[PDB]
Amino acid sequence: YDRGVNTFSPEGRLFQVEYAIEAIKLGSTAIGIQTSEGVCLAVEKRITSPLMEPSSIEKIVEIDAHIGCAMSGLIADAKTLIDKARVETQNHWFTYNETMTVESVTQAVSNLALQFGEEDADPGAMSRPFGVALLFGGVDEKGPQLFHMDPSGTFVQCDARAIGSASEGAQSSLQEVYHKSMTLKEAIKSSLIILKQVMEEKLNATNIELATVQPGQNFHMFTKEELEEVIKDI
Amino acid sequence: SSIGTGYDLSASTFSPDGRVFQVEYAMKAVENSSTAIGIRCKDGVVFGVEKLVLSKLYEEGSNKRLFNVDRHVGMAVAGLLADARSLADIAREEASNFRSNFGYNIPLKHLADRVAMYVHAYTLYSAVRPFGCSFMLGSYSVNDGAQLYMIDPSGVSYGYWGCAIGKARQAAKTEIEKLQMKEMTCRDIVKEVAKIIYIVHDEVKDKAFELELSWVGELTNGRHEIVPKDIREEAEKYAKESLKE
Amino acid sequence: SIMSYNGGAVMAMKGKNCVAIAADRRFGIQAQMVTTDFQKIFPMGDRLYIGLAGLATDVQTVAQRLKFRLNLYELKEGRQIKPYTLMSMVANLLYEKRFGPYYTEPVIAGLDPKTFKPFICSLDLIGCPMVTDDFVVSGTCAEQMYGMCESLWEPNMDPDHLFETISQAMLNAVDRDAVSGMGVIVHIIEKDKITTRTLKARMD
Amino acid sequence: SRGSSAGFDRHITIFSPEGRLYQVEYAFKAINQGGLTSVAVRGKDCAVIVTQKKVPDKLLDSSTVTHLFKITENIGCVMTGMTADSRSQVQRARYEAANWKYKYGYEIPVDMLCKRIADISQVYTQNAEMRPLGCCMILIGIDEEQGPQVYKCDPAGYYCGFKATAAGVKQTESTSFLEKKVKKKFDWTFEQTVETAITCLSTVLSIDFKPSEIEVGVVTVENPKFRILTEAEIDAHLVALAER
Amino acid sequence: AERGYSFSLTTFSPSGKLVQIEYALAAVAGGAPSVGIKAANGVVLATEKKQKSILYDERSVHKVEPITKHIGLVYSGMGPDYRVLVHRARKLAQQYYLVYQEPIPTAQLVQRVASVMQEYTQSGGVRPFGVSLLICGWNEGRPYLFQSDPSGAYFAWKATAMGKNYVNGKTFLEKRYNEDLELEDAIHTAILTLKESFEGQMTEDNIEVGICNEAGFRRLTPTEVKDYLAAIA
Amino acid sequence: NQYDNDVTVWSPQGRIHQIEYAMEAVKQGSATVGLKSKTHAVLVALKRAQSELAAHQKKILHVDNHIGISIAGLTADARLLCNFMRQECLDSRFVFDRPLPVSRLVSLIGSKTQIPTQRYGRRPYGVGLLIAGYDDMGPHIFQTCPSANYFDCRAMSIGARSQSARTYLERHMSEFMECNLNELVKHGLRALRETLPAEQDLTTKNVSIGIVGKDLEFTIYDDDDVSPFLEGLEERPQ
Amino acid sequence: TTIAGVVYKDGIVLGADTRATEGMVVADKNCSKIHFISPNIYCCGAGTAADTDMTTQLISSNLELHSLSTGRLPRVVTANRMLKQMLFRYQGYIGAALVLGGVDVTGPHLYSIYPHGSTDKLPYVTMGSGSLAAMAVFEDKFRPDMEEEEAKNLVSEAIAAGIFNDLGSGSNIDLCVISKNKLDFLRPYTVPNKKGTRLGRYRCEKGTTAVLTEKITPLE
Amino acid sequence: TTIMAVQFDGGVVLGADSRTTTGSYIANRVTDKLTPIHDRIFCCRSGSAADTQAVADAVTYQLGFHSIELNEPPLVHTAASLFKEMCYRYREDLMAGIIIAGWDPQEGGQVYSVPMGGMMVRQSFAIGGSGSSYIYGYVDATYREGMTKEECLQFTANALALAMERDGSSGGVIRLAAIAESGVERQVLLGDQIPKFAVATL
Ligand SMILES: *[C@](O)([C@H](C)CO)[C@H](CC(C)C)NC(=O)[C@H](Cc1ccccc1)NC(=O)[C@H](CC(C)C)NC(=O)[C@H](CCc1ccccc1)NC(=O)CN1CCOCC1
Numbered sequence A: 001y002d003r004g005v006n007t008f009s010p011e012g013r014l015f016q017v018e019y020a021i022e023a024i025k026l027g028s029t030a031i032g033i034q035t036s037e038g039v040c041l042a043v044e045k046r047i048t049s050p051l052m053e054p055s056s057i058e059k060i061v062e063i064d065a066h067i068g069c070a071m072s073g074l075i076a077d078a079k080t081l082i083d084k085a086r087v088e089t090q091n092h093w094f095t096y097n098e099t100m101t102v103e104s105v106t107q108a109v110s111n112l113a114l115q116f117g118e119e120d121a122d123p124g125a126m127s128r129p130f131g132v133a134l135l136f137g138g139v140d141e142k143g144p145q146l147f148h149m150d151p152s153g154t155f156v157q158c159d160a161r162a163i164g165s166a167s168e169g170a171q172s173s174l175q176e177v178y179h180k181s182m183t184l185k186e187a188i189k190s191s192l193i194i195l196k197q198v199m200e201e202k203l204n205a206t207n208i209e210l211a212t213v214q215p216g217q218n219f220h221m222f223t224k225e226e227l228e229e230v231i232k233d234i
Numbered sequence B: 001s002s003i004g005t006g007y008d009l010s011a012s013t014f015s016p017d018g019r020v021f022q023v024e025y026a027m028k029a030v031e032n033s034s035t036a037i038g039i040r041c042k043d044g045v046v047f048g049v050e051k052l053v054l055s056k057l058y059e060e061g062s063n064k065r066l067f068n069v070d071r072h073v074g075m076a077v078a079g080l081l082a083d084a085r086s087l088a089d090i091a092r093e094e095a096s097n098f099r100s101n102f103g104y105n106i107p108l109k110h111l112a113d114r115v116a117m118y119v120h121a122y123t124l125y126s127a128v129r130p131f132g133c134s135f136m137l138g139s140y141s142v143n144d145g146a147q148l149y150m151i152d153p154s155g156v157s158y159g160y161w162g163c164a165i166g167k168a169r170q171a172a173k174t175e176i177e178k179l180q181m182k183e184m185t186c187r188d189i190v191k192e193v194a195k196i197i198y199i200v201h202d203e204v205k206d207k208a209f210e211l212e213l214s215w216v217g218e219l220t221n222g223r224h225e226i227v228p229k230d231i232r233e234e235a236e237k238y239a240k241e242s243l244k245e
Numbered sequence C: 001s002i003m004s005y006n007g008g009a010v011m012a013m014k015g016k017n018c019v020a021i022a023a024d025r026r027f028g029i030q031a032q033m034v035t036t037d038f039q040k041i042f043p044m045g046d047r048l049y050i051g052l053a054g055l056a057t058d059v060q061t062v063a064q065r066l067k068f069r070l071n072l073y074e075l076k077e078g079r080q081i082k083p084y085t086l087m088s089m090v091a092n093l094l095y096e097k098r099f100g101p102y103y104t105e106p107v108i109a110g111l112d113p114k115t116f117k118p119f120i121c122s123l124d125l126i127g128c129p130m131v132t133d134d135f136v137v138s139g140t141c142a143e144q145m146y147g148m149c150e151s152l153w154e155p156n157m158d159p160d161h162l163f164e165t166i167s168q169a170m171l172n173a174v175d176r177d178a179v180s181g182m183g184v185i186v187h188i189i190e191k192d193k194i195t196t197r198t199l200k201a202r203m204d
Numbered sequence D: 001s002r003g004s005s006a007g008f009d010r011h012i013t014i015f016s017p018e019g020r021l022y023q024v025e026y027a028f029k030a031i032n033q034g035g036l037t038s039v040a041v042r043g044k045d046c047a048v049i050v051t052q053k054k055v056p057d058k059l060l061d062s063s064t065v066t067h068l069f070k071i072t073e074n075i076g077c078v079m080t081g082m083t084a085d086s087r088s089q090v091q092r093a094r095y096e097a098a099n100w101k102y103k104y105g106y107e108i109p110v111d112m113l114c115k116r117i118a119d120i121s122q123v124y125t126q127n128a129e130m131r132p133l134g135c136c137m138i139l140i141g142i143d144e145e146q147g148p149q150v151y152k153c154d155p156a157g158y159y160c161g162f163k164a165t166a167a168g169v170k171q172t173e174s175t176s177f178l179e180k181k182v183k184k185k186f187d188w189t190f191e192q193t194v195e196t197a198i199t200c201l202s203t204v205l206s207i208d209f210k211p212s213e214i215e216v217g218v219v220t221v222e223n224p225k226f227r228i229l230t231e232a233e234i235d236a237h238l239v240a241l242a243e244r
Numbered sequence E: 001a002e003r004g005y006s007f008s009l010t011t012f013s014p015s016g017k018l019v020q021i022e023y024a025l026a027a028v029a030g031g032a033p034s035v036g037i038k039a040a041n042g043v044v045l046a047t048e049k050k051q052k053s054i055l056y057d058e059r060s061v062h063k064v065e066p067i068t069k070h071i072g073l074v075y076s077g078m079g080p081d082y083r084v085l086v087h088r089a090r091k092l093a094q095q096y097y098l099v100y101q102e103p104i105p106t107a108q109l110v111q112r113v114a115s116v117m118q119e120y121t122q123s124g125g126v127r128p129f130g131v132s133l134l135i136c137g138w139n140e141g142r143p144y145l146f147q148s149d150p151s152g153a154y155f156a157w158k159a160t161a162m163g164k165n166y167v168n169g170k171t172f173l174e175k176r177y178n179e180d181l182e183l184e185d186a187i188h189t190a191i192l193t194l195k196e197s198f199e200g201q202m203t204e205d206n207i208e209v210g211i212c213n214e215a216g217f218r219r220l221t222p223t224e225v226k227d228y229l230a231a232i233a
Numbered sequence F: 001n002q003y004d005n006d007v008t009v010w011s012p013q014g015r016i017h018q019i020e021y022a023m024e025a026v027k028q029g030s031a032t033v034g035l036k037s038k039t040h041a042v043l044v045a046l047k048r049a050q051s052e053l054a055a056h057q058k059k060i061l062h063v064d065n066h067i068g069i070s071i072a073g074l075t076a077d078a079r080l081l082c083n084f085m086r087q088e089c090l091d092s093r094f095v096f097d098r099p100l101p102v103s104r105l106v107s108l109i110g111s112k113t114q115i116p117t118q119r120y121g122r123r124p125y126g127v128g129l130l131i132a133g134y135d136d137m138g139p140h141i142f143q144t145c146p147s148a149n150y151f152d153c154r155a156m157s158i159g160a161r162s163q164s165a166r167t168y169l170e171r172h173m174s175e176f177m178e179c180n181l182n183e184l185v186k187h188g189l190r191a192l193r194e195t196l197p198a199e200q201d202l203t204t205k206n207v208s209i210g211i212v213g214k215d216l217e218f219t220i221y222d223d224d225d226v227s228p229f230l231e232g233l234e235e236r237p238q
Numbered sequence G: 001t002t003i004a005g006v007v008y009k010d011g012i013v014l015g016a017d018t019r020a021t022e023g024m025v026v027a028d029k030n031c032s033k034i035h036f037i038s039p040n041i042y043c044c045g046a047g048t049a050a051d052t053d054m055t056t057q058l059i060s061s062n063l064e065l066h067s068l069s070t071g072r073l074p075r076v077v078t079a080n081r082m083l084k085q086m087l088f089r090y091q092g093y094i095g096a097a098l099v100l101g102g103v104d105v106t107g108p109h110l111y112s113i114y115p116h117g118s119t120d121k122l123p124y125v126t127m128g129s130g131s132l133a134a135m136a137v138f139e140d141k142f143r144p145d146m147e148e149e150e151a152k153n154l155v156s157e158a159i160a161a162g163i164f165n166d167l168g169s170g171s172n173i174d175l176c177v178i179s180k181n182k183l184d185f186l187r188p189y190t191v192p193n194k195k196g197t198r199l200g201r202y203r204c205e206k207g208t209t210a211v212l213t214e215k216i217t218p219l220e
Numbered sequence H: 001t002t003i004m005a006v007q008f009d010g011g012v013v014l015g016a017d018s019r020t021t022t023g024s025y026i027a028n029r030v031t032d033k034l035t036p037i038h039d040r041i042f043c044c045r046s047g048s049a050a051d052t053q054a055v056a057d058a059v060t061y062q063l064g065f066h067s068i069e070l071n072e073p074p075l076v077h078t079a080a081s082l083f084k085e086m087c088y089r090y091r092e093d094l095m096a097g098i099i100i101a102g103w104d105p106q107e108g109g110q111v112y113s114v115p116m117g118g119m120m121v122r123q124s125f126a127i128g129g130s131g132s133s134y135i136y137g138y139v140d141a142t143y144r145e146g147m148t149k150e151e152c153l154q155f156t157a158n159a160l161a162l163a164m165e166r167d168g169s170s171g172g173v174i175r176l177a178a179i180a181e182s183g184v185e186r187q188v189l190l191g192d193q194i195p196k197f198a199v200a201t202l
């Protein structure tokens, strides 16, 4: 039995969107932590073969010099959203000569939420929701901020948040170790610990990627050596 | 009178016995709505609506089922309210365009014809569904006269002396027939309208209700206006008193 | 004038059971000559030639698009094209650009592929057809060509007298025009054969 | 075959295994839903339309209930079937006529009007997005040389000229009546035509009408303007019938 | 508001059959029979124009239609579809004439109309035509007879039949007819092969005949049909 | 089951199931209350949180200097409708240099939201709205449903367990028209808190307030700015 | 050009010269300016040659379609409407002055149609560069209900006036008589102008033309 | 050209010259400028022949369809309004001066002017065309309220005669039309029928 992509369930929800939420659960788990010293984003790479170059797996990307993004689920869908975000930030800079607040970027991307449909639509318009979940970590005038967005388009600020396959467990483990006054080192440490817990493979310097955005320093992707130096104090 | 094996899922699909069940279903949606009546006297047209109240939290005059389509044309609706409002928009725009093109107030028969054609345009394709409401257009002029028309979801338009639409359509029609509106005046008629509304109303199944009333005639210079609170309370008093016999 | 930018001359003459078509060979820009071997006559099939005078670009372009439509015609239909048919085709093609016309005045000369009946016509830049029984001219030196043709042409000419006539007409008309010349080419076509000659002409 | 079906051939306008269009036939059945019957008869110097006027309510302004429509001053029509669809087709007819006169500078022939309307119906017959109209149109009018003309068009796209026809519920009975009456060869005068029509409808319904139970359209050679008969001048024919 | 169905209503069955076209042909082989005969000096088209009552005016609608001054049409199947195809064919012919200033070759008109019919077996939201066409013409001296079926395919015929009993009519023509015939003879064997399925008194108003010689195409008058239907003349 | 999946399909009972299913989306969100005095219009919204580490969802949005809204349903549709209302208001100010009458804006919302309920492949807006506004007809509380129907209210509550709030408001309607601002916000907060089990109550972390009036443009109080309203309330019963 | 038209007792006479010019030079000495619209309707064309051609052809085609569908003989008002509406839609950019003549079921009808889309129904009309002369002949020697030969004489006289008095007109006179049951498309109705006979022999004998290159190519 | 329309009690009177010129040449010395739009609705054309003809045709079309759709005799004001809409919308592309006049069961005899601007105004009487300039004074000094039908007839006849005498772009014949509930009475004043006036001698 087939139906339209904008059909409502008797419960009052859109089938395709819910199914996209279901699609997220099969993606690599990622954790973002907000801290007055900066925001951190960590994610497992899930390398399926020794032949696969792990440096070509980026689930953490730079939206702008002050904003980075972590993604989980169908990455191919996420690429579009990332580019849209970058373009939005640059347009805003061009127009207003200032940086975008993390919330504004997150909202902008969130506006592409239910922009799908069949009839009464453009030829190039989306046929289905984006099967991906996003964590926007960045530093603006309101300091360090972390946001979460799902295919529903509902975006909300989080102090600490985990998305992906091991979402629930990692979220519990996050609740157990978060107080609104951690240092950034503590946040990174905790992130990597929970990551090591939830990952099926042995956590190493080529198994994941970690990035931080702090009030004094731009978006920084942790190199192999730095990753090792944090994994060191396991 | 009940077939439904795929033949009732579209307006672009006839039934094997030559029926368009989508339209009839929309008509059934009209039937499940509270009754609205309208009657023409020798000097105009009066509208009365049984506006059921779903909550005491709602302000008085909320969800008006009486609309001003043109300064000389009023509209009484029955059924799915949103559709009724959109249709009111269409009627308004039609009247406006007619004025802007021909230079005078649109004759009621023509407005009814146009809007009815627009309604009918929805009973033919699978891309859209028929409107879920029926409505009545009332007007008066000296060169035209007193006129009252009615349109159902199929697109059928007819001229009436008295008419009703909704739950107790027939129950109201039998009460309207008793009147001699061809000789009476819109002043006397209001009371009888309120009366028929109170009679037809079912105080048991349906809860509390508010009564809406509308003038359009020689007593209003041809303008379609709401019935003043005085005359309305007078008619309601007459109705509540006539309910004790 | 736009037509005079490149210059040139094209002529066609009728014979007994033969037909003739000639054109100068100069490709020049206003007053300077660039080439002395510029083709202005194109075969639209066996025993059917067209000759375009005017703006060189539109000469080549009209020729090419005409060959396009012609090929498609002779493919859709299992036959060679009739002269009248080709004429109407050119007329249509030119008139499609009624308000942005190609600057060329085509001249068609050939023999009916079924019969052998000679045929000569000319057209506007917007494609108005004109069929004659004697001669047709188009070019910057049209008045000179008219002058020669009105005095040299005889009715039933054999393939040798026709050659001499059209050759003298072309040569002597062209020699009184500054932007037409640098050689003359003549195609004399008959049922059996086609004879192509380049005349001895002034090159100044 | 012989009643077979496959796919959506009973839902949209596509071919059945035996090469039928079920939706079209269903539309023909939709014509009868009105529960009315119309009769058209062509005379020697006129053309006559007659139709039931079922007004079961005194609450209706009986002047607004009509199945007779003026397409042009010289072209009249009667619609049988679904009311809204009928009015739609009448609007389209009026448009095509007015546009015809605008483009060609002369009044459209009944022949050509009917042909046009039918051609429009054919599209509904061939496209699946829409459904044919549940109505049948009968046009009447005087032609400059061919004289009185009575044409009819179907939801199927069929159109034809007639000496007489009918539409609606008791169509077949009315036709069987009319051909029987035609074979006798009478002097088809005005009154002969009107009487033949009214009596066709009457003896087909067994009612014997009051002058307010039917409506009669008409068009004469001496008076080509489409004329609708008053209750009085209908009652005249009615009392003229109860004498012989 | 309306738009249209953008998907084909005619698709391939697992066996490989375009079912809707075959059903269209089923509609074709169900209408009144029509014969066509090419006869060296002309072409003849004939059809059963049997109405269904005395009330019908047979002198208003015709089954034998002219496309131009030299091309004619008859059909087997559905009337309205045929009418549409006639209008379209006439238009195509006029386009050809406007471009080339020469009357359109019969084969060309046939090919173009065939393309039009082909469209409705692939284009969105439409069914194929329930009509087979017999097209007669006189171009370049020679006479021409063509048939086009709902699939958009077309064939050249010396003689043939369509509609009810088209097989019996085809064998009949295959036997009791051949080349070198004159127009008169062809008309005769055409009304004769039409009589092989005429379940009734075949009058001059029960059938319609059109001829196409090298003097143009035209529809035979009821009088000429009466002369022919006297089993002679 | 065969009349469930398209908004252009009437049920044989004269109903449209997709519309009603869309109506069910309003009840999926956190409850919200709206009430008006004679000088002020007030929205009180119960913000909801996923986990304790996630901030509470915004429920009150600014439309114009004289108009604000409270949402209940799909946040995307809510943002859409909000941007629409904002745009219409801006248009009204650009053209007439006067603020758009609230009732007219609501009418436009009705017209816009009605359209997709009648076209194939389209869907109703999965969001309910409470609109608080002030114009020269006074304060106004309006309610808009996915069915494109709208209501002019004295008081209203929509969403999860909003029945309690409704029941509360229906008793204090008579009091509402004469209350000062603080008493009005009080009543709103009590109505809102009625939609909660006794194990939980209102907090500065999960309550938002929107206020518009004759002396005040539409303002949103979220955290520490809510305390002056909460502090001054009964202890509630069990 | 110099086209004219007249209405007599039994029908209509149309006239036209045959000179076509480009610049101040005669390009065509024999050009047919009387065009077929329908078997009962003809139309003379003056102005931009290609425009008159394509316009008259197009309207002829549309009328053929029209009569094909209607089964009747085309009316003149129809051709007039089509022509004037098309021409008006192009706001005079189609240089086509026309004389439309034909016999209907309503009788003989003669229109003049100017390239801007305006028409005049008159018993006699003239168009072209030589229209003033022809119109002078008409205004001088026209009477209602003329006989066929009389009207032919009048029209040919008018066209002649155009031919000799206007530098834009020249050569032959073409007539077209249209009655309720006849169509006389008299081509060279009169050849009042003749080229003088050659007084010499400028024939070039085979060999007088020097040749640089030759190439024979056999066909089939 | 020179058109005119005067309103009496039970209807209107229309008048026009018959000269149509291109340059200084008279392309038609016998034009029919009074064009029927409906049974009792006429219009007087001035300006571009093509423009006025096209617009008149279009308005006849529209008004015909409109009157059929309403099943009532069309208001003169409605015809004037269609003309007004067309002439105003395409004012930069049309050269048209129109006088729409006729009878109507609701308002009786009516005369409306639609000058080149595209505006519309009802008048007791209206004049237009190139010749109208020469008769403004006469028409001002001669008009009297309550004129009979025949008085209006003679009035327009005289005015048009004077204008035609003075204006070179006007002349030929005088066309008159009388419109009332009765119908349309058209007539033509030619030669000696056209009113003459004493020309100065010594
Ligand atoms: C009227 O107004 C009075 C008599 C005063 O003018 C009359 C009556 C009308 C209702 C017929 N109007 C005219 O006589 C009228 C004047 C006019 C000129 C130009 C534009 C608009 C109005 N004459 C015509 O309209 C006439 C129609 C037929 C040819 C009879 N055509 C023209 O006047 C030509 C207009 C076309 C045009 C030219 C240039 C740019 C755009 C459009 N004018 C010409 O000069 C035509 N032509 C070329 C030059 O040599 C003579 C022939």
Ligand SMILES: CC(C)C[C@H](NC(=O)[C@H](CCc1ccccc1)NC(=O)CN1CCOCC1)C(=O)N[C@@H](Cc1ccccc1)C(=O)N[C@@H](CC(C)C)[C@@H](O)[C@H](C)CO
Pocket (backbone or CB within 6 Å): C003, C105, C123, C124, C125, C126, C128, C129, C130, G001, G002, G019, G020, G021, G022, G023, G027, G028, G031, G033, G045, G046, G047, G048, G049, G050, G052, G095, G128, G129, G168, G169
């Ligand atoms: C030589 C014949 C085959 C055709 C001749 N063609 C031509 O003269 C065409 C005109 C093409 C054109 C383009 C844009 C806009 C308008 C016209 N000219 C060319 O083909 C080549 N040139 C290009 C540059 O040098 C000058 C001409 C022609 O049309 N002659 C007209 C006169 C004319 C009027 C306006 C513009 C151009 C020409 C004619 O004969 N008209 C007669 C009527 C007939 C042909 C129906 C008459 O009117 C009588 C003879 C008086 O001329």
